[PDB]
Design a protein around this ligand. Sequence first.
Ligand SMILES: O=P(O)(O)O[C@H]1[C@H](OP(=O)(O)O)[C@@H](OP(=O)(O)O)[C@H](OP(=O)(O)O)[C@@H](OP(=O)(O)O)[C@H]1OP(=O)(O)O
Ligand SMILES: O=P(O)(O)O[C@H]1[C@H](OP(=O)(O)O)[C@@H](OP(=O)(O)O)[C@H](OP(=O)(O)O)[C@@H](OP(=O)(O)O)[C@H]1OP(=O)(O)O
Ligand SMILES: [Zn+2]
Lengths: 245, 45, 220, 220, 220, 220, 220
Amino acid sequence: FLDGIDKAQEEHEKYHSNWRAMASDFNLPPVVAKEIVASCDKCQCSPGIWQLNCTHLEGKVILVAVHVASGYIEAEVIPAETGQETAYFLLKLAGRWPVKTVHTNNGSNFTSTTVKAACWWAGIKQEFGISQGVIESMNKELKKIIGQVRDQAEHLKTAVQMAVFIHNFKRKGGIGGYSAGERIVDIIATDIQTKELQKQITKIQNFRVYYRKGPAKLLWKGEGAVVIQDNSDIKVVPRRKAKII
Amino acid sequence: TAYFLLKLAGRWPVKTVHTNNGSNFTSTTVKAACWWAGIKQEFGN
Amino acid sequence: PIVQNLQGQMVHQAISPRTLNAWVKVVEEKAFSPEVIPMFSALSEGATPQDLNTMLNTVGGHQAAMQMLKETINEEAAEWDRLHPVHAGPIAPGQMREPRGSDIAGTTSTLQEQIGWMTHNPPIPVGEIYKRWIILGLNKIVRMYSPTSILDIRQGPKEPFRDYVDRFYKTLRAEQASQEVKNWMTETLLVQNANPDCKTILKALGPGATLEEMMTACQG
Amino acid sequence: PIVQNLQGQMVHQAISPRTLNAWVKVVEEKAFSPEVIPMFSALSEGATPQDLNTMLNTVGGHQAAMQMLKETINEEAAEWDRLHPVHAGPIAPGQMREPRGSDIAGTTSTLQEQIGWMTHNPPIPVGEIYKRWIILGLNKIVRMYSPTSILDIRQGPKEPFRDYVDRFYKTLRAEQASQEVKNWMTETLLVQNANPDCKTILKALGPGATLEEMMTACQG
Amino acid sequence: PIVQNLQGQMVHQAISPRTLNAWVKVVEEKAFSPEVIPMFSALSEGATPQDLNTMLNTVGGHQAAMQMLKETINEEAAEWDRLHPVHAGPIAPGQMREPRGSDIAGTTSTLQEQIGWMTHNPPIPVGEIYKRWIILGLNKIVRMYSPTSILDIRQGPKEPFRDYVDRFYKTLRAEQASQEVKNWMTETLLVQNANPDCKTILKALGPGATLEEMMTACQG
Amino acid sequence: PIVQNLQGQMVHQAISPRTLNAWVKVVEEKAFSPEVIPMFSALSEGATPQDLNTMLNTVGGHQAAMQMLKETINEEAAEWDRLHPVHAGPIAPGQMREPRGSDIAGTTSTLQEQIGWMTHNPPIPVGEIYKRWIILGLNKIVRMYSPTSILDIRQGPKEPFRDYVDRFYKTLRAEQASQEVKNWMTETLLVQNANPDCKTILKALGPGATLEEMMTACQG
Amino acid sequence: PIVQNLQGQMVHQAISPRTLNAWVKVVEEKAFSPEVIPMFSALSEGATPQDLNTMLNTVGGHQAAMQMLKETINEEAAEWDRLHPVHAGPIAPGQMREPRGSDIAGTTSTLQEQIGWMTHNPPIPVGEIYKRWIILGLNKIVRMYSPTSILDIRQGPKEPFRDYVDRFYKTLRAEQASQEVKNWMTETLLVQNANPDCKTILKALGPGATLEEMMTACQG
Ligand SMILES: O=P(O)(O)O[C@H]1[C@H](OP(=O)(O)O)[C@@H](OP(=O)(O)O)[C@H](OP(=O)(O)O)[C@@H](OP(=O)(O)O)[C@H]1OP(=O)(O)O
Ligand SMILES: O=P(O)(O)O[C@H]1[C@H](OP(=O)(O)O)[C@@H](OP(=O)(O)O)[C@H](OP(=O)(O)O)[C@@H](OP(=O)(O)O)[C@H]1OP(=O)(O)O
Ligand SMILES: [Zn+2]
């Protein structure tokens, strides 16, 4: 806040970011951030769930992939519509992020030989036909930020990359006011630590609980409740009628 | 090179970078690209 | 290649390795873009049909177009054989009869016959006829490799029209229409298929407006 | 092109692949900056109009510039036809009549006509006239391709005057005007729109001094 | 360029594209370091002033130094004209008048006049003089690109003396001054700007000693 | 540089740009190592001192070595002037006195003086003397740029003899001394500084054994 | 090197930088495989001993091989001195001193007397003798760089016979042997060391069959 108004103005003249981003990053009250936004003439699921789609912009085809559970985006303008570039983008996004499922349509390029080879090589599950409202809203938001930044852009690729860079970091999301990158980092880190801790205790703790049936294994005991799993089915019972051995 | 640097910035947050003195690394385009993203450019660990 | 000696006589020479290396690398780098069509005539000046065949055989891959051009060469050789009456009888010393289809194709005529025909008076531009046949084959190959037509191209609502007109002319050069039709389309299509503001400015300018004034009027 | 032998005559030669490759790569890489204007004259000395036409045709992309060059060549050919009307009467043996506009453009004239005209006594500078027409076309195309004018160059507050005057001279050289007008620009506009501190320093220095004092004055 | 026939007379030839490409590449790629002074003098062993101008104006970017050298060339031409005015009166047949300032600058004189001057008896190395003029400007150009002075060089606490003395000699060579003052400063400023340990070691060796003993003591 | 002419008197020749490009490339890519000594003599055969200075100034960076070699050149020139009788006074046409200490360095002598000296009868190999002075400077600066010694190379228990003898010979060539001491060290140190197994093998082989049987016995 | 002038006589020339650069880079980067032996004989044709030793010592790396070949050159010089009687006596015009072992190595002789030997009648092929000595040394050093014997090549159970026979032939060529023993080995060893299935297949095929039958039968 100490002389941060000047920095906020000099960075909003270049980014045109939302008021909450300036408030959180630069430690400014929301009122002055909203005033800065107004004063600008240009402003008024599992982690593997990824959706890829094709859009048309100024006579150019663009393939854009979105992380459904975190809002992360990645777009690239394909020069000539062919499945080879679709497969190249798929393998690049696989090499940059772990993906377990693909949500695309039944297009010819989506079912290309190279795309199928790449998806089989990566072991990614394929699901044709599809939540889409979030994809459409992100598409319109990227279109409007592209329109905003096109005045200072020379080519389409640079403008698209600038829009992606602004959207993924300089835009606070929903719950908690966290950007797409923060959300995806948080969710993948939490998944990693939870799976580590879950795999850590399986070797040590092994108890057998009888209820009402069979030798089920203890999963969680406390708060007057026993949750267990038997025959790949999870059952929750009260503390009564449950013997722990 | 500036396009690749912009892609890297769009994927991960970068604050500073150390690089050698190659001809393409000292060009005006990469200088403008790092001026945009506010990358602390250092030549020369 | 056949290069005239300095204050001497035209003597046949071997093809330089670097020229054919450049030809094959530019063929493999580009997917038979129209710009390679003039470049061919920039590399095969005064070359015997045997040299043309040797240069043609250097291509790696893209054999469908090579088969198509070979078929068109064969049919053109048949047409040349059928249109020109075949002289029969003794061969005059120092000269030779009209080349056959396989002779103009260069697959049977020896180098000595090619040299004799080149030095024959009146001149025999058999190599030039073969080069023109190859040019026609390359034109139809470019038509084969055209990814889209010209009448279906559209201009983006917010696209700067510089790239629009650039790609419009790039696609236009690939067209195999008559010159008058080309003039008509380059006068009507681009002015009738623009953005509303630029099209309004152009129709205000009226007909007979050169493309320089066309683009300077729509500058933004 | 056509090269002169050691104390000999002017003999034709095929186009060197290195020259055309360098030309096309420098055109692609350097876009349409003015510094390519001299390079063209470095790669076209003693060359036939056919060679210039081939070199213009080899470059791919930017087809609007090529179309504008073609139309300017056509109108210059019309001007040549208009200033030198169609001659009549038999031509003496060993001589060829004055080339038409199409012959100068090279669209209807074979290389043999160029060879005859170049070696004719007195020499016919058809190639030089075509080169000058291409130079005028390139001048107008680089005037067209200039991103902005010269009267709107604004110096940033934190921007040092080094790159400011560099781009000011870039736009000045990109502008086509008279030598006296350019001198007036370099005398007034360089200081009339500078940063206020440098403006005051230059006013303290006094008009009528070399720009070396200007660059050594406002350092920092 | 200007060459001599084998046991014959002097002739003029076109400029090799390779040399111009290498010159422009080496100028643009690295920097405006002092090694441009030898490199340029290694690519102009005999050429007309028009050739020098063509080699000069092809540079892309950094037009500020180009304007500096153009202004220095103009003032040198003016001073040459005022100190040695071209004598008036009749001109003897078979010769031509003395080149003017515009002639040595190459702005107005044609290539034929330059060739005639080079082959004249006695020969006029006017273009060569022009080259030396450019050299003078180039010196000032290096003064443009010196980032520091001859005194603000200091050795870091973790910086070995190798790159320290390398930078010191680089800045000394970038300095345009007398040789005697350079010798005076290289015998004194080296020890003053050195880390205390090796500084005191080399002082114990003896002041004014050559760098051989200094570097043998400063090892590690 | 200096080119021998076909049954004719020698004439001055410029330096090919590729020669300088290769020289600067090999200087930059590899640090100061003995292998640059032959390469130098492979690019400066019969070259004039001016050409030697021009190619020496082309280097970039490492100016400390350049200053050291300039100092050694100056001291060698002073010694040469002291040992040979100084010359002065007028000389008959077609002849001139021997080059001074500054003339052999090329800092005051012009190209014409060097040409006259090399074409003199009998010729004066001043260029060869300057080249051998440069060779001595290169030897001493390669000795300067050798970090490791000859008496410190050790063979590891698992280290093969191949790279051991390789580095031994690297250091042997990097060290400048008499031939006899080089033979003594290359006969004694290699066996005296090896693993015990190969040491006993070589002792069994006996003194004075050839290197081939030595290394085919130590191998394994 | 010494080259044949067009319709002229033998003329000495320096080594082009391209040839030596290509030689050193291919030697350092590709291998010490025997296929480099023809390459050398394709580069040193019509050379001089000075050029031979300059090319020999320029290449860096693997200096143990350089010392080995120097030792073999010294021993071959001793052999030449001892087998060929040394004729000591007066030297008359039309004759020069007898070639020596050190003269063949180009150590005690300079370039001009080597040229005189080349032009001397009767011709003295000292360069050819040095080249064949280098060939013998290179054969010894390529024998040194064969890590495996010829009797230890065994086909792996899962190893395809293609690369197996390829490396078998490579090691056979690298092996120093006569023609008849090579024929015996290529007739016996390959079938005596194959996989059992192809072993029985080729035994069923029987003798008197070329490698085509063996390779068509061992597939699968
Ligand atoms: O055009 P490329 O296929 O890449 O080959 C070039 C070309 O060599 P050629 O003229 O023999 O084909 C260069 O010559 P120019 O482009 O200047 O006409 C040459 O340059 P130098 O001869 O001056 O070395 C260069 O070599 P380099 O890459 O070392 O600069 C070499 O490339 P390659 O060496 O890779 O074949
Ligand atoms: O040796 P050649 O087969 O006759 O080819 C040469 C050679 O070029 P390459 O080494 O690239 O093949 C010359 O280079 P130098 O050997 O003289 O260094 C080159 O001269 P430039 O590279 O300086 O242009 C010359 O070209 P030109 O005849 O134009 O002087 C060119 O001859 P070609 O043009 O016939 O290939
Ligand atoms: Zn805004």
